[PDB]
Each structure stands twice: as structure tokens, then as C-alpha cells.
Amino acid sequence: AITVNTNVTSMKAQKNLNTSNSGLSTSMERLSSGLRINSAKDDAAGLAISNRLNS
Amino acid sequence: NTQANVADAKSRIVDVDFAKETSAMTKYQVLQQTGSAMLAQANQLPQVALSLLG
Amino acid sequence: SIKAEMDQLATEIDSIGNSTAFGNTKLLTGTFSAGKVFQVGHQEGEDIKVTVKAS
């Protein structure tokens, strides 16, 4: 099991780093503005309710 | 008499309420320091690329 | 003259009753006469009932 053409250990390691980087990014923008529902990624029903409360 | 009542009506439209304004001013001061720390720390995100051997 | 004052005060008791709302749902016009249900647990049957009679 000693190969020099594919490194599956690297492939799994790369995915974990991408997930941790994306989580760090989304936390900064929530902190920089102060809103949990920045986009429609988050609670779909929350933004609809908030719009009527804003009115 | 009518002069005093018109002064009432005119102030409600053009004059600020310091209770409202002071809270907003302090409200944004915190957001500024929060924004500056987030921006400074977000600027050094790409330094991760230096860890993976240049 | 005294009745003309009492008459308008009773109009607002009507007006608050028909206006008080949570975004767009009126809360004092009997739609909460038979208590509505909120679920506060993670399984069926963990519910709390809030009843508001019409006023």
C-alpha cells in the first residue's frame, strides 16, 4: 500500500481544512455587522417574520 | 398664545431628541471598534498559504 | 359633556383590542381563545399552551 500516484490522505485532509476555513469566514461577517440572518442561507422563515416586525 | 403652540408643532418635526440620538451615537461607537478588529484579523487570513511550504 | 368624554374612551378600548398584533397576527380578538401550542422539547408531547381571551 505504498503508492506515488494518489494521496487519499491529502484528499481527506484538504476537505477538513476547507470546512474549517468556511466556518471561520462566516463567523467574522456575523460579528462585523451584528446580524445572524445576513443572507437567505440562514432561517428562511426568520427573515420573512422580521420583515413584518420591521414594518 | 398661538405663537407658543406653533413652536410646539415646529420642534416635533425638525428638532432632535437627545435620548434618541445619544443612544445611537454610543450604539455605533461599539460597532466601529468591532468592525476594526474584524477587518484587521480578516486581512491576515491568506497567511495560511505560507504554512503549506510557500 | 361628561358622556361625550366617556364615549371616546370606550372607543379606544375597542381600538387597542383590534390593533394589538405580533407582526400581522391579532392577539386580542379571540384567535387565542382556545390556547395555541408551542413545543419546547425535542419529542412529541412537550408542549406549552398560551390562552388569551378576547378583550
Measured between CB atoms, which of A21, A25, A31 is closest to B34?
Answer: A31
B47 vs A contacts (CB less than 8 Å): none
Chains B and C touch (3+ CB pairs under 8 A): no
Q: How far is C24 from chain A (nearest CA, A)?
A: 7
Cβ-based neighbours of A40, under 8 Å, separated by 6 or more: A47
- Please give the span between the terminal C-alpha atoms of chain B, in angstroms, as a whole number: 81
Do residues B34 and A31 lie in contact, with contact meaning Cβ atoms separated by under 8 Å? yes
Resolution in A: 3.5
Do residues B35 and A32 lie in contact, with contact meaning Cβ atoms separated by under 8 Å? yes
**Structure-solving method:** cryo-EM
Burial (0-12, 13-18, 19+ Cβ within 10 Å), A45: exposed
A24 vs B contacts (CB less than 8 Å): 45
Q: Does A3 touch chain B (CB under 8 A)?
A: no
Helices (H), C1-55: 2-17
Residue owning grid cell 437567505: A40
Cβ-based neighbours of B42, under 8 Å, separated by 6 or more: A28, A32
